[PDB]
């Protein structure tokens, strides 16, 4: 009979030289550290008002993971990772009503390595204004999940697509959505 | 493209009945495979796969190393649980409820937290336990869930349909009725 | 309150 789980998850990937450090509570991200700006980014602004975390520490663990990756790469005789393509899903935040603010959620799940290209498309054209996303979230099977969001005003005329590129896919994957 | 090599580490804190019982795990991964771990219920590192034996023997041979990890349930888990308890374990957000037709009658429950929830369908005061299809609990990745519970029926005049949602955030059952 | 991280051990060379 389990109740709660807190996870401090981290990773480092070569040749990309990309690392990640974050805390997770029952599946949701509490925060992660932006390695570049060297600061803590809270998942919800409110969180950062009651707690804090020494961001620099994340860099210390990451530096050890780099050294560890090299050590493990050699131990395994340079055995590369096997690409696992993502499963992609598009849905809205809530019931859609014409002319009422909503949010399209593009869910990328069960994939590795932690590298993807995600682009929102409205009537075939790329959309960036107002979009946001999460870092790579850990899965209990050690693959990853990721969320991309697009706030929008529903119309009978607009059509949307979440395009996802991953080395595990022979070709880009497109998940479609339109006001039914 | 060129081969990728991934290293992951997961420090997990499993809490049961608050902090009365706590289990700590220091997990190491090469790509998607866990090769070595320390389980606080075991007391020392153990190889998960042959690849991790070197690390188990190495780390286990250092009294000070094991000493620190054995005290992690206290110096790490319990401390962190207390830090964010007010905005995580105690987080509460109301279920937004909307009932619309689709032949189906859909009850969309949105924006709630925590995740455990009870959604039941009623007709003229009598619960409909057959012909109810739920999409399951859907995580929005922003500390809010959503779920759609459909009732397979042919809406008719004179008939009263009610969706009843029970959730920790609400003091008493939330009901929304729909009529054709 | 302040969150504290857990250390990541360096593997055996």
């Amino acid at each position: 009979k389990e109740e709660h789980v807190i996870i401090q998850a981290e990773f480092y990937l070569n040749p990309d030289q990309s690392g990640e450090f974050m805390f997770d509570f029952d599946g949701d991200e509490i925060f992660h550290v932006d390695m570049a700006k060297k600061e803590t980014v809270w998942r919800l602004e409110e969180f950062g008002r009651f707690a804090s975390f020494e961001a620099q520490g994340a860099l210390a663990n990451i530096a050890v993971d780099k050294a560890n990756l090299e050590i493990m790469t050699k131990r395994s005789n340079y055995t590369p990772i096997t690409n696992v393509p993502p499963e992609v899903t598009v849905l809205t935040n809530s019931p859609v009503e014409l002319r009422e603010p909503n949010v399209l959620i593009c869910f990328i799940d069960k994939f590795t390595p932690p590298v993807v290209n995600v682009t929102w498309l409205r009537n075939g054209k790329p959309v960036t204004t107002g979009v946001s996303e999460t870092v790579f979230l850990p899965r209990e099977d050690h693959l990853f999940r990721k969320f991309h969001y697009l706030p929008f005003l529903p119309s009978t005329e607009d059509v949307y697509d979440c395009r996802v590129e991953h080395w595990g896919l022979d070709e880009p994957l497109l998940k479609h959505w339109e006001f039914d | 493209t060129r081969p990728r090599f991934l290293e992951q580490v997961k420090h997990e804190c499993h809490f049961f009945n608050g902090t009365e019982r706590v289990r700590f795990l220091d997990r190491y991964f090469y790509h998607q495979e866990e090769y070595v771990r320390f389980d606080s219920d075991v007391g020392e590192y153990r190889a998960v796969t042959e690849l991790g034996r070197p690390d188990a023997e190495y780390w286990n041979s250092q009294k000070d190393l094991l000493e620190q990890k054995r005290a992690a349930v206290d110096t790490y888990c319990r401390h962190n649980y207390g830090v964010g308890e007010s905005f995580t374990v105690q987080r509460r957000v109301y279920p937004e409820v909307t009932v619309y037709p689709a032949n189906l009658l859909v009850c969309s429950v949105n924006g709630f937290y925590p995740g455990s929830i009870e959604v039941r369908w009623f007709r003229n005061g009598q619960e409909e336990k057959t012909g109810v299809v739920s999409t399951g609990l859907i995580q929005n990745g922003d500390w809010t869930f959503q779920t759609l519970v459909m009732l397979e029926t042919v809406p008719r005049s004179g008939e009263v349909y009610t969706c009843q949602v029970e959730h920790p955030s609400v003091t008493s059952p939330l009901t929304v009725e729909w009529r054709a | 309150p302040k969150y504290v991280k857990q250390n990541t051990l360096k593997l055996a060379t």
Epitope: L59, I62, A63, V64 | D64, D74, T75 | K10
Partner: T-cell receptor, first 114, second 113 residues
Framework: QSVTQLGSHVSVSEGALVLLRCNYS??????LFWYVQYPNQGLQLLLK??????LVKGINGFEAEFKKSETSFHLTKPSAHMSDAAEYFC?????????????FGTGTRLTIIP | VKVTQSSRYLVKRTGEKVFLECVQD?????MFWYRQDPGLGLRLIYF???????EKGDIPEGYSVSREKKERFSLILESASTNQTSMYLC????????????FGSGTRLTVVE
């Protein structure tokens, strides 16, 4: 985090009681260290508090008790020996092994009067 | 397990640009620079947890560092001033290691006009 060592210079007659003060401030699980610098030598770790035990016994006959309530970690020794003349430094850290930045006290110079 | 500092002693003139070296061959990820002065103990000037990483300590003013290679952590005095006359201590460690600081032999630097 912070540490303070009330008493920069302390004189003790030999055979007497040695007491060097160390107080700390920490909003996270504390890990304290006592370093000693004998003349013409580099800092040596005397003992440390890892939370494994409240009473820590160190080398060279020294002892220290972690008192969460008083937020203290005083270094003490029953009988002062002429070879204890040195400078003692108290330090605090957020890491369990003292491998990430340590914050040092101002230090105390211990003089033994024969 | 040794941390070696370039010089044991140095004399430099005000305004000059001074370089204090620190190198360790243990593949430690963490290196720090502290200055030691009577009645002030050890004060953290700058520290680094990885290659190219620089973090201001508690008294960075007047100094700067450089961590281009993991093995070396250089402390730099842009325009040396007399109040920078002190005993500089280098230390190295790894967050992934079951023990702490490894101090260097120190570097006595006196800045004269």
């Amino acid at each position: 985090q912070s540490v303070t060592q009330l008493g920069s210079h302390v004189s003790v007659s030999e055979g007497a009681l040695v007491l060097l003060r160390c107080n700390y401030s920490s909003s996270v699980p504390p890990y304290l260290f006592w370093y000693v610098q004998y003349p013409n030598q580099g800092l040596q770790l005397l003992l440390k508090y890892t939370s494994a035990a409240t009473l820590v016994k160190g080398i060279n006959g020294f002892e220290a008790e972690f008192k969460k309530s008083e937020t203290s970690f005083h270094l003490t020794k029953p009988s002062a020996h002429m070879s204890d003349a040195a400078e003692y430094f108290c330090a605090v850290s957020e890491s369990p092994f003292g491998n990430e930045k340590l914050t040092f006290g101002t230090g105390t110079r211990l003089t033994i009067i024969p | 397990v040794k941390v070696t500092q370039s010089s044991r002693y140095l004399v430099k003139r005000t305004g000059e640009k001074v370089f204090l070296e620190c190198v360790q061959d243990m593949d430690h990820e963490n290196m720090f620079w502290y200055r030691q002065d009577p009645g002030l103990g050890l004060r953290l000037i700058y520290f680094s947890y990885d290659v190219k990483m620089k973090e201001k300590g508690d008294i960075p003013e007047g100094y700067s560092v450089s961590r281009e290679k993991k093995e070396r952590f250089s402390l730099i005095l842009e325009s040396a001033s007399t109040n920078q006359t002190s005993m500089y201590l280098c230390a190295s460690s790894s967050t992934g290691l079951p023990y702490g600081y490894t101090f260097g032999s120190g570097t006595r630097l006196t800045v004269v006009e």
